[PDB]
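Annotators were shown the component list below and the corresponding predicted structure, then asked to write short factual statements about the assembly.
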Amino acid sequence: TEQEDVLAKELEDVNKWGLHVFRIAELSGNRPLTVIMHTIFQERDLLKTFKIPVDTLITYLMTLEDHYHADVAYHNNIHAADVVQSTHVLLSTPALEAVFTDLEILAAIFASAIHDVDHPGVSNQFLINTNSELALMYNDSSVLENHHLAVGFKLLQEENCDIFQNLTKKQRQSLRKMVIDIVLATDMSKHMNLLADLKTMVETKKVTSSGVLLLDNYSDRIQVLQNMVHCADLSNPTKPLQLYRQWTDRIMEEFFRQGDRERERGMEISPMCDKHNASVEKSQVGFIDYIVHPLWETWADLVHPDAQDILDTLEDNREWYQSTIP
Amino acid sequence: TEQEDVLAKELEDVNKWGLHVFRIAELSGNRPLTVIMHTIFQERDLLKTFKIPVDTLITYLMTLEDHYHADVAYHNNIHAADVVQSTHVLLSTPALEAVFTDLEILAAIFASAIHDVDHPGVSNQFLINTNSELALMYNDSSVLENHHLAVGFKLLQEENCDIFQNLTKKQRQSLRKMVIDIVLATDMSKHMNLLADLKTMVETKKVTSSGVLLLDNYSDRIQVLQNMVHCADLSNPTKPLQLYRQWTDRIMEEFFRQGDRERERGMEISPMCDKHNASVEKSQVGFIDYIVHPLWETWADLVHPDAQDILDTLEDNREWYQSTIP
Ligand SMILES: CCc1oc2ccccc2c1C(=O)c1cc(Br)c(O)c(Br)c1
Ligand SMILES: CCc1oc2ccccc2c1C(=O)c1cc(Br)c(O)c(Br)c1
Ligand SMILES: [Mg+2]
Ligand SMILES: [Mg+2]
Ligand SMILES: [Zn+2]
Ligand SMILES: [Zn+2]
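Structure shown to annotators:
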């Protein structure tokens, strides 16, 4: 039973950027989402604040984890655990201390946990172009993200899975709306608009006397939580390289498998999905330069200087992937 | 068998506001959606422009009509026909003569036919507040309208129902996007924004010297079609009084039935849904004053003055309903 002692020792880094999430996945018996969510809920005293029975929390978490696909290389329960833990660290940043309520914290962590549930390993555009049942259900609009939300909420109805059973009716209504707004913002088709609003908030930033962010309306509060979970979703290149490279190996396997399906169907191969003509290194550099660095540099400005070490690791990782090209 | 010749002479005025849809409904064996769509398809020469096997048109329209509930007093197949024919007439507006292409004409017409399919007779807010499966599926966002679209498209996958089988893949993709954008605009939560975009467009109206409208970008074009089918959706108070009064008796039955369900479940009663405290007549005047007339007067200005007759009839029916108030 000393393996549980090793897992508990690793869980002490749950407040740290760069958690060994793949080792925790191994040490916990492929339950990184459950043990990391449980650990975070204890750390933030969320089981007592919202009167969540321990058995119900574990039962939902194991059920939610179950509905991530173990046979998809990237969008699986490890990624969900990683986004959960990354959002947890971002919530603890000094520029946001006491800024969000316990319900908003609960919503952002819950949203992170469910944000990719039941992901089949193919993109929205693939599901649209192949006339999938999901794209038909959701009228080609945020197809996956609507599905993730629907599954995440529906699993609360399985027996002893309603972790929100002791929230008031107004608490559940408020949380549900916030979770929906947050997970829908993980659709990359919303990235440019989400970042434009984040830049506007940085340019017009307001700070209280305590030194923390001033967010006095739902629109600004939910936009920060949306971008926070979005940043955590796109946090792989900001992590220590040995973690970043495994995430890159995993997403490229998922892309190549999609491209092979686009080839078996006589379709145009999606960018970076043709394993016969893809540059993994050049795609990561372009992903950082055009998407990840603009986002994280903007977030770093919002919480300046709390995120400087994360931004430094991103720029180091970009310099490294660049060096592998020549 | 004398009804078919009776059914024939009513359809002759399919190009006129005030079609005897209820007579057409009864004269057709409760199949007004089928016979009104077909008559309009022949009038606008749509079966030849898009190569649609007329037998496939009938098989889908009957399948589509069957998925409208027979036990709902308003949101059924008769409403679906009336919106179709009203949209058809708004398309023949002189200031909009050939402004929209053939595919954009087919888009607004097909969208009208499916825009309320499988409606359960209760509102989005009822479905949301009762934790319905529909609201769970669609994350409380345009619940009914997303469903209408999903059903209307799903039925095309039935035997000999793909009425768009001979459209090019680009035509089908363009038709799908416009149908979605149009039916989603029938959600009343989008009314004010839709009206506002109609307000700003009026202030920036650019026309010929024969007066007709000039729409260049897709955004301006789709907004006109959205506000058009929305205008047809809310065209009851602009019809002849005998038609308007029948639609009012039906929608108030549907409202009262929802309010009774809101009571036997113990929830707050939606406005105008409490039969023990409803003023049907006052509700109609207020519905015209705050929703129907501001929409149709903004529409009239954009089409100055081809909608003066519709605007006059609406003001007449508003005056009559007001007179019914003691
Ligand atoms: C669309 C542009 C883009 O190009 C890449 C190349 C490598 C890795 C990620 C990306 C990427 C993303 O923004 C992205 C974001 C999310 Br969220 C995903 O779930 C996936 Br999949 C991809
Ligand atoms: C929300 C205010 C309102 O009050 C009314 C009173 C009588 C009739 C219609 C309405 C009405 C609508 O806007 C409306 C619009 C559509 Br579309 C419907 O499918 C239904 Br149902 C109602
Ligand atoms: Mg996702
Ligand atoms: Mg409707
Ligand atoms: Zn993700
Ligand atoms: Zn309608």
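Statements collected:
1. The first helix of chain A runs from residue 2 to 11.
2. Residues 82 and 266 of chain A are 35 Å apart (CA to CA).
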